[PDB]
Structure formats: structure tokens, C-alpha cells
């Protein structure tokens, strides 16, 4: 079950209200392995509290680290089905234009399809 499947809409809305109040300078982000992704491993924790100043490039490096990936391994972080146009984009901006109706900012990570 994904994060959205483990907690109801109302529950998540409340999760966000609580976190945004306790941490006004933090962005609540849910990062999960794309449902069609099988090469990359699964995170131990998919709920993140990200400082609003952090940009995508920085976030990506952290997730790569968490996943214990080699820089040589393909990794992509997609928001609403697309990689952010610019990695220098602050998470605060991503949150403003891509956040879910429940208040969380959702992202999925994937590598690449294989062919034989």
C-alpha cells in the first residue's frame, strides 16, 4: 500500500495542518518508489520534512544517498509525472505549484526500463 492508501484523505489533511504548524519553514514531502519501478530499492522512510530553501538537486542527492546509490546509477525524481524543469528550483516553489490537494507534495522515483 502506498502512503495515500494507508491514511485517509482527512487524515492526511490533518497530518499536514499539524506539520505545517509545528514546522512553518519545512515542506512535507512523500517520496516513494514509482509503482512500475523495480530496479531501485525501497526507502525505509517515505515521509520527509524538507527545509523550504533546499532545491531539487539537493533533495535528489539526499534520496540517492538514502537509497545508497552510486552516482553511476540512473535515478529520477518525478513530480506529478514529470522531472522538474530546473533542478535549481527551491522545494518551496515545487510545493506551491505541485502539492496535492491533501497538502502533501508527492514524488516518485524511478530508474529506467530495460530491453532485451
Amino acid at each position: 500500500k502506498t502512503f495515500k492508501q494507508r491514511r485517509s484523505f482527512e487524515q492526511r489533511v490533518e497530518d499536514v495542518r499539524l506539520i505545517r504548524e509545528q514546522h512553518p519553514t519545512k515542506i512535507p514531502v512523500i517520496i516513494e518508489r514509482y509503482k512500475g519501478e523495480k530496479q531501485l530499492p525501497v526507502l525505509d522512510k517515505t515521509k520527509f520534512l524538507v527545509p523550504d530553501h533546499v532545491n531539487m538537486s539537493e533533495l535528489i542527492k539526499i534520496i540517492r544517498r538514502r537509497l545508497q546509490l552510486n552516482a553511476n546509477q540512473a535515478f529520477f525524481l518525478l513530480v506529478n509525472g514529470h522531472s522538474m524543469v530546473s533542478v535549481s528550483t527551491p522545494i518551496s516553489e515545487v510545493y506551491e505549484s505541485e502539492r496535492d490537494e491533501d497538502g502533501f507534495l508527492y514524488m516518485v522515483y524511478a530508474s529506467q526500463e530495460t530491453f532485451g
Partner: protein, 309 residues
């Protein structure tokens, strides 16, 4: 003397009728008047397909890559196009009866199905083990690119600089540093991307087309579901590509006709292209790299971004 209905080369072209130019690795052709040139350019590219009856990999492994080597083959093709540009030039063209430059056979030899060839299926599959890929395991674009980079190290003849830009970002400073190493090592720039979850947003299509319109264009590797192809251009809303999905006997000497696809180029709807790809560019000189950067800047939505540090 008999007069024959000499079926000219490009008479077999099966191109659609709506005349948008035809782009092949940085070259634009008219489907109306340059059918010969289009087919020559396509047939000239080094084509690598499945092969059977080559030396058993690892001595006791497969003697054919049918069914599992398709992406490795696409990797071979795009890297070979880089070597062709690096050693023969983008303007070089292959001719079935014309004696080719010795440098041509050196490039081809590097991809022959032999253990000692720099980029042979044997070398790629074995090097892939180090990348976490078992022999016979399917590859994605980046993986084969990473393997080719490691193999290129031993190719002191080409002495290439192979930069694989990860994370949708091309860092010029790192590229310059790599190329200025032991003053500029020809650059093979590979950019592995994931332009969507299951499809490619139409917004990237214009950008994708332009990736084939640059002088430095090496094309793209990726494909349709379960069908990897080496895309070398496009026409209208269709990508043009070389398909490795044909099993041919290992060459027994180098007779080279089987390494040239002398048929109307395969085409598939741009819409069918899966989001997992690797875009390639070749910059022989620092000026070529500067021009490429300028061309990228000129560019609905970008597939990657150019940054200094």
C-alpha cells in the same frame, strides 16, 4: 545488349507522402530529391544485430545474444557512430563495392563478436557484471552507456572522453575537466533520461526532434516496449531507427555487408517511444562542444539543463 530495369537504390524507399524534411543525425534531407542521400546515410551507419555462433562468452556462456542483447546492441550502434565520427567523420559514407579506409575496419573490428575487441558483446556483457548485471540480463540505456564508458578506457586508439550526464544535468565544468585530461579528448556525451512514467509528455517532442537536428547528434537509444532501437532521426511525427532484433550468423573472415542495414529505414510513431532513453552527442573539439552548448541554449520543454558547476 540487354537493357535492364535497373532498380535504383532508393527506389525501394517506403516513405510516407507528407514531405516534412528528413533528419538523420544532424543532417536534413528532402524526401523528394534526396532519397539516395537518405538511404546512403542510413545504410552507412554501423548496424549491430543479434548474432549467433560466436565464441561462448566466458568459455561456457551463450554463443548468441538473441533475446537478451538488444540494448547492448543499441549501445554498440550509438558508440560506433561516435567512433565513426571520431575516426572517419560525419560525412563519411559506406559503399558496398568501394574500398573503405583502414580506419573503418578498425572501428568495425572493435564491435566484432570476439573477446578481444574493445566493444564486443563479450566485453560488454562481462563488464556489465561489474555494474551488477549478470550475463544475459536485460539492460536499460544508462547501464550500457556506463559499460561502454569503462570499456572505452582501454581504447587508447580512440582516446575518447565519455561523459554520462546523470540527473538531467549536463555540467560543463566537469566535461571540460574530463576532456582536458591526458588539449581535448573527443567527447562522447550521453544523457540518460526518464521523460515520464509510461509516456513522454508531448511538450518534450519538439525538444526530442531537435536532439536529432544538431551537428553533434549521435541519436537516441531506447525503444518501444520490449523493443530497443537505435534512433538516428525522424520525419514528421515518426522516429527513424536501426533495429538489432534480427539474428545473423557471426561473421567468419571482414565481410561487412551484414553490418549495414540496406533497407528502407524502420519508422515508428514518436508517440510510441518509451520515456527511458539516452541521448547522445559527439563533440570532437572544444569548439564543437561550445557550439553544442549554444545550440542547446537556443532551445517546448527541455529534456535536460546545461549548467556550469
Amino acid at each position: 545488349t540487354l537493357t535492364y530495369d535497373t532498380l535504383r537504390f532508393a527506389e525501394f524507399e517506403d516513405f510516407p507522402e507528407t514531405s516534412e524534411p528528413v533528419w538523420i543525425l544532424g543532417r536534413k534531407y528532402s524526401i523528394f530529391t534526396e532519397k539516395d542521400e537518405i538511404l546512403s546515410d542510413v545504410a552507412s551507419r554501423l548496424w549491430f544485430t543479434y548474432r549467433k555462433n560466436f565464441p561462448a562468452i566466458g568459455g561456457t556462456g551463450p554463443t548468441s545474444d538473441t533475446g537478451w542483447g538488444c540494448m547492448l546492441r543499441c549501445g554498440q550502434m550509438i558508440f560506433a557512430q561516435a567512433l565513426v565520427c571520431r575516426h572517419l567523420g560525419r560525412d563519411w559514407r559506406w559503399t558496398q563495392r568501394k574500398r573503405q579506409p583502414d580506419s573503418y575496419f578498425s572501428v568495425l573490428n572493435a564491435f566484432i563478436d570476439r573477446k578481444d575487441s574493445y566493444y564486443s558483446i563479450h566485453q560488454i556483457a562481462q563488464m556489465g557484471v561489474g555494474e551488477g548485471k549478470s550475463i544475459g540480463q536485460w539492460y536499460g540505456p544508462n547501464t550500457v552507456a556506463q559499460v561502454l564508458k569503462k570499456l572505452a578506457v582501454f581504447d587508447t586508439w580512440s582516446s575518447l572522453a565519455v561523459h554520462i550526464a546523470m540527473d538531467n544535468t549536463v555540467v560543463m565544468e566537469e566535461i571540460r575537466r574530463l576532456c582536458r585530461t591526458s588539449p581535448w579528448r573527443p567527447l562522447v556525451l550521453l544523457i540518460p533520461l526518464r521523460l515520464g512514467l509510461t509516456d513522454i509528455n508531448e511538450a518534450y517532442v519538439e525538444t526530442l526532434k531537435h536532439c536529432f537536428m544538431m551537428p553533434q547528434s549521435l541519436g537516441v537509444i531506447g525503444g518501444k516496449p520490449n523493443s530497443a532501437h537505435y534512433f538516428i532521426g525522424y520525419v514528421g511525427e515518426e522516429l527513424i531507427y536501426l533495429d538489432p532484433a534480427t539474428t545473423q550468423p557471426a561473421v567468419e573472415p571482414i565481410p561487412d555487408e551484414s553490418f549495414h542495414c540496406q533497407h528502407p529505414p524502420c519508422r515508428m510513431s514518436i508517440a510510441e517511444l518509451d520515456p527511458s532513453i539516452a541521448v547522445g552527442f559527439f563533440c570532437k573539439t572544444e569548439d564543437d562542444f561550445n557550439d553544442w552548448c549554444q545550440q542547446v541554449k537556443k532551445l517546448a520543454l527541455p529534456m535536460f539543463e546545461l549548467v556550469e558547476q
